[PDB]
């Protein structure tokens, strides 16, 4: 996260770190959506242009964390993966359309003060909250700058951007399964996700029922926090039929 701030303790209890084995490193962010299911970006797990192709046994999920590098004894919980499910129409060739994957954990995780699931939006949630100017929150342990690494989980609040402005900021084809967020050059304020934050959650707090909903998944940006560029997020509600289908089947 670029130009964010340190998270408070328990501020994002659905935050999940995807942690690679051999070599021990940050793989991506993710989010906890039940005691057994974690949500992330497909390109975190499968991305042929960068020779990324992680299998179940290559990584661990670390839930309830705050410090990036510490082993947070008695606070974090480390889970092994049972199965990865990547969207079958994930478009890694062109534009990261449907950049979304689920991971089922071998064993349910116990909830605590630091570990707790986020809600997924329904159609009404999306229609009311996913509007230009409305802000959500992005969290992660990714790089502080495009060109170092944080001590603790970072947080930034960012406004959703109008779809034409999103489209006009990039040469990439932007689909209805994506939205973009971030400040415009003349808004003054700054902030973005960066390398290591992909897969993490873009959340909003509904003012109707005072619950947090994961509206987006951190997907991609042209660099990080560049003037006139925005971050692109997977639109979770548009992919919810797929999410439900996977959880219901497996």
């Amino acid at each position: 996260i670029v130009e964010g701030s340190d998270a408070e303790i328990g501020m994002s209890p659905w935050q999940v770190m995807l942690f690679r084995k051999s070599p021990q490193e940050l793989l991506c962010g993710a989010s906890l959506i039940s005691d057994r299911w974690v949500l992330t970006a497909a390109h975190c797990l499968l991305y042929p242009p960068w020779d990324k192709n992680f299998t179940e046994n290559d990584l661990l999920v670390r839930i309830g964390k705050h410090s990036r590098t510490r082993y947070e004894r008695n606070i974090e919980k480390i889970s092994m993966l049972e199965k990865i499910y990547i969207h079958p129409r994930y478009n890694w060739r062109e534009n990261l359309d449907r950049d979304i994957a689920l991971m089922k954990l071998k064993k349910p995780v116990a909830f605590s003060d630091y570990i707790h699931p986020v809600c997924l939006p329904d159609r009404e949630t999306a229609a009311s909250l996913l509007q230009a100017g409305y802000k959500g929150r992005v969290t992660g342990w990714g790089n502080l700058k495009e060109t170092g690494q944080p001590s603790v989980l970072q947080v930034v609040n960012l406004p959703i951007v109008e779809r034409p402005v999103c489209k006009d900021s990039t040469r990439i084809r932007i689909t209805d399964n994506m939205f973009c967020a971030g400040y415009k050059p003349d808004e003054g304020k700054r902030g973005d996700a960066c390398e290591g934050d992909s897969g993490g959650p873009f959340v909003m707090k509904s003012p109707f029922n005072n619950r947090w909903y994961q509206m987006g998944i951190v997907s991609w940006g042209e660099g990080c926090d560049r003037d006139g560029k925005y971050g692109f997020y997977t639109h979770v509600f548009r992919l919810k039929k797929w999410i439900q289908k996977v959880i219901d089947q497996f």
Binding site: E8, I9, M204, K205, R211
Partner: peptide
């Protein structure tokens, strides 16, 4: 049933330092 209600915040009726920024954007 309990999704999106944080143990150390909503559950105890405490607000975090920047959530009011999001609320103010929700017109």
């Amino acid at each position: 049933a309990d999704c999106g209600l944080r143990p150390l915040f909503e559950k105890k009726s405490l607000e975090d330092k920047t959530e009011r920024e999001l609320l103010e954007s929700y017109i």
